[PDB]
Amino acid sequence: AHIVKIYDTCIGCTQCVRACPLDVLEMVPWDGCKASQMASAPRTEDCVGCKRCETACPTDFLSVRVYLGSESTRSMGLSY
């Protein structure tokens, strides 16, 4: 399983969620920014680490990171 962490510079623009091809990110209520939202990663056992969430983040140096870790049969994307 990989390590996906959301940081506090998030502005809650939902770009990371629409870019995730595996549905491991979701938007939770929050009271720290104008949009009153913040991303969260409740299902990092389904993540494969494609790093589209990092590409979609607008704020400079990113508000979401994907640290690579120990692979499994789901995090390798093996269909056989």
Partner 1 sequence: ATKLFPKFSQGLAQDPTTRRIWYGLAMAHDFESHDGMTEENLYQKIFASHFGQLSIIFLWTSGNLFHVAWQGNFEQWVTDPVHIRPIAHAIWDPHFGQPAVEAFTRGGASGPVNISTSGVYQWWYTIGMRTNQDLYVGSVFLALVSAIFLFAGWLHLQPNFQPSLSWFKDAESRLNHHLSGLFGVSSLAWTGHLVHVAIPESRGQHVGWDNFLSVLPHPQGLTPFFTGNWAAYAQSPDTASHVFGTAQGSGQAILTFLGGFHPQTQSLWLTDMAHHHLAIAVIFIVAGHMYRTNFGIGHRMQAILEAHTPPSGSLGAGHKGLFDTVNNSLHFQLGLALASVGTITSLVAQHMYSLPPYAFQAIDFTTQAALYTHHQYIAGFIMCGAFAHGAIFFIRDYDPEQNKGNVLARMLDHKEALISHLSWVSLFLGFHTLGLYVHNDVMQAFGTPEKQILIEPVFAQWIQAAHGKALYGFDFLLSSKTSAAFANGQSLWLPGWLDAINNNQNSLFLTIGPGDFLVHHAIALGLHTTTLILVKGALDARGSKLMPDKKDFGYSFPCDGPGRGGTCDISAYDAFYLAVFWMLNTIGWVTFYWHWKHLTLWQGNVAQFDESSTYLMGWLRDYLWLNSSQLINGYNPFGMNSLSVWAWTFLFGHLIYATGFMFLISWRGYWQELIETLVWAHEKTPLANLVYWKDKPVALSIVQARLVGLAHFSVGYIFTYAAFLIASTSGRFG
Partner 2 sequence: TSDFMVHHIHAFTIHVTVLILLKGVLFARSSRLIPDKANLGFRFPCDGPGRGGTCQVSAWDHVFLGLFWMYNSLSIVIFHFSWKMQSDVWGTVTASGVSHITGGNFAQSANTINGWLRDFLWAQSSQVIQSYGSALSAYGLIFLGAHFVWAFSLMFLFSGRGYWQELIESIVWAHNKLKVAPAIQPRALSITQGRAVGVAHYLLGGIATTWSFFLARIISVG
Partner 3 sequence: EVGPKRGSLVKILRPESYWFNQVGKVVSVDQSGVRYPVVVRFENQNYAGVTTNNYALDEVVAA
The closest alpha carbon to 50, from 31, 22, 28, 73, belongs to 22
Residue whose CB is less far from partner 3, 60 or 79: 60
Cα separation of 57 and 11, whole Å? 10
Nearest-approach distance from CB 52 to partner 2, in angstroms = 7
Was 33 annotated as part of a binding site? no
Residue whose CB is less far from partner 3, 40 or 46: 40
Residue 76 tokens read as 């390798």
43 binds partner 2 (CB under 8 A): no
Was 20 annotated as part of a binding site? yes
Nearest-approach distance from CB 30 to partner 2, in angstroms = 27
- Inter-CA distances, 11 with 40, 46, 53, Å: 12, 24, 14
Was 13 annotated as part of a binding site? yes
